Amino acid sequence: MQAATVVINRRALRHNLQRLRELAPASKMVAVVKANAYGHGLLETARTLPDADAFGVARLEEALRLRAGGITKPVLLLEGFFDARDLPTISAQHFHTAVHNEEQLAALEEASLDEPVTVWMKLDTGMHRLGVRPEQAEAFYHRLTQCKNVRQPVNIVSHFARADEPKCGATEKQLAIFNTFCEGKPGQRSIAASGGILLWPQSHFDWVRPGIILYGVSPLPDRSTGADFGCQPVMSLTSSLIAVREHKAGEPVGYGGTWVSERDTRLGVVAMGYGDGYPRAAPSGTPVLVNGREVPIVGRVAMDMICVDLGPQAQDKAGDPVILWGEGLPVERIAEMTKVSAYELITRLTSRVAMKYVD
Amino acid sequence: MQAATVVINRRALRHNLQRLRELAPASKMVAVVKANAYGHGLLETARTLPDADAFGVARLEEALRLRAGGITKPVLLLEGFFDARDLPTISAQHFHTAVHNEEQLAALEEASLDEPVTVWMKLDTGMHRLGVRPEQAEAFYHRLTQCKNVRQPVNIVSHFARADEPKCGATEKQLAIFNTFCEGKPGQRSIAASGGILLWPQSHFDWVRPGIILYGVSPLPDRSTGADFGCQPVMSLTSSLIAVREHKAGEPVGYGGTWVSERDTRLGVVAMGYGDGYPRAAPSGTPVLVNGREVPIVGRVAMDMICVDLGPQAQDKAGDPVILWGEGLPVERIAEMTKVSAYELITRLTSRVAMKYVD
Ligand SMILES: *Cc1c(COP(=O)(O)O)cnc(C)c1O
Ligand SMILES: *Cc1c(COP(=O)(O)O)cnc(C)c1O
């Protein structure tokens, strides 16, 4: 039988990269593949997009894992390097890096490399997470153009904190700061991720960094799905029923007796739980497809199982196909119902989930 | 590594198995290691406990993975087998199985195996998740004693739905039903997991199945910890700071501008996010240890990073040790602050977290 499985549509992945090129026609693409390509799988997602101009990762470990799998294209270390002793590898592996601190800068200044490295100075334009603040940036920037170990020109990168909230002036302010600092400087500019790409065409510049929407999922907090932008969903979280049992009115289900039935019915048990990555927070009523028909989750989600209400004469049987989200049921619909971010839903899955690739 | 890492204390693990033998002195132990041993590591956790009477898993795949690693004790398939074509492997691998449906029973009835298999009839005593209902149990049970494919005697297993709620009578009702069915029967009895073991000594019977408490974490939802029962915490979710930046009063942090500072201060950025398994639901103020000193999380938890408030003048720096939960900080405290179950915190982690084993 088949249990917890993530089916990845390679065809939809391809379609989305091309669709994003159409929406951002004058910008190169940094396919962001951090966290195991967003739960889709880091090396397979890269191999599915040999057309990507570059790949973005959070950590050096992820980039090296790409190189190990035979990925040859430029990989961008979005958070830079955490140890100065890593520069020689970064240089030799032809990894491009962000530089946000003095550790990183002072290291590049005194390292001894056999080749210089391509760098993207991270500028803090409002997110206040990583990056050099405006009033320290000019001096920091100038030191990078003097590094014999940095390939010139120095590129400039930044990130939006609230691009999915078009009504507040957060984005327009970050853009204002970004634009002021880049005036008169050569080198590529990049500040847009999924939100900036879809809602802010002024922020496309030279390179855009699609992450979530690359997988056909909307980065927005409203009811929108990847299909709202012509992007197709890549992931399908699937499983199977391991039991179909009789149940009676007044009887509770699961831990804590969270749900009590008002009628005699039949309950289905799914080989899926939070030990696989399915949200334990999922409330009774959350939709799940059984034999391509939507049924509600009843009772608390356990570590390995989920119960659903099928109906008194429901003819579903142990072994039948279940879809937690995918074709027929967008992950955005599960996010709305469970109140869990689609970003976390597709990404916080465990190694217990099998991986399938189609097309 | 210096980033996302889970450190597993093998010596605390052994201490807990024997501490549990002291709490349930007349019962054998079924070490429950399903879902990658609750995030601690399926095969390493088994190898650390060669003293366990048996190992419990959710799925067949997990049991096979144990045999592949050289684990030889008896392994109990807590949910049984999902396909009749699996009986031959299960018989040959000497896996013990639960039997809750007719598909499983009919499979045993007509299979041809070189050896009979040890079975635990799963009885639904109130949880209404898996198991044969009371009114169908006697006939179902009798068919199992007539199998030459089943090693006699037929053992009886069940599970509590609310053992962590001593004030509702649910547990005494399940126990009442369990006891009535076992009257006059010749096999082993088992109904207690972590809660039943600690709060209900009349449910210990022949075998107890410690899961969460085996890892030194309390099953109950009140604020007690594993140390309340003499059990030592096995897991430590650790990482490092990748940046220490200046921040000013009135300035927000992270996505959505969730947190705004009322002083000038210094922010630390941790190489930890929900792409690793850390709850994106963690509210500002949640505790983190930086250099063995507690600091609050400020702003939204991102996929790869977490910001903390260090103070205006604070001497922490990129590279310094961070503890998300562990030595200075029980996962139960993080569960309270996060309102996320300790079961899910330690279990729903991703494959990007490195694994260390000490002692
Ligand atoms: C992860 C990340 C991205 C992608 O963002 P999405 O909203 O998922 O598209 C792009 N850039 C940086 C700096 C990131 O850390
Ligand atoms: C997983 C499980 C356990 C162990 O539960 P804990 O609450 O962690 O003690 C024991 N028995 C069964 C039937 C289970 O599914």
Curated annotation (Swiss-Prot), chains A, B:
Protein residues bound to substrate: 129, 303
EC number(s) per entry: 5.1.1.1
Catalytic residues (positions): 34 (proton acceptor), 255 (proton acceptor)
Subunit structure: Homodimer.
Catalysed reaction, written as an equation: L-alanine = D-alanine
UniProt-listed Gene3D superfamilies: Alanine racemase, Lyase, Ornithine Decarboxylase, Chain A, domain 1
Underlying gene: alr
Role, per record: Catalyzes the interconversion of L-alanine and D-alanine. Provides the D-alanine required for cell wall biosynthesis.
S-S bridge residues: none
GO biological process: cell wall organization; D-alanine biosynthetic process; peptidoglycan biosynthetic process; regulation of cell shape
Modified residues (N6-(pyridoxal phosphate)lysine): 34
Classification via InterPro entries: Ala_racemase (IPR000821), Ala_racemase/Decarboxylase_C (IPR009006), Ala_racemase_C (IPR011079), Ala_racemase_N (IPR001608), Ala_racemase_pyridoxalP-BS (IPR020622), PLP-binding_barrel (IPR029066)
Name used for this protein in its record: Alanine racemase, biosynthetic
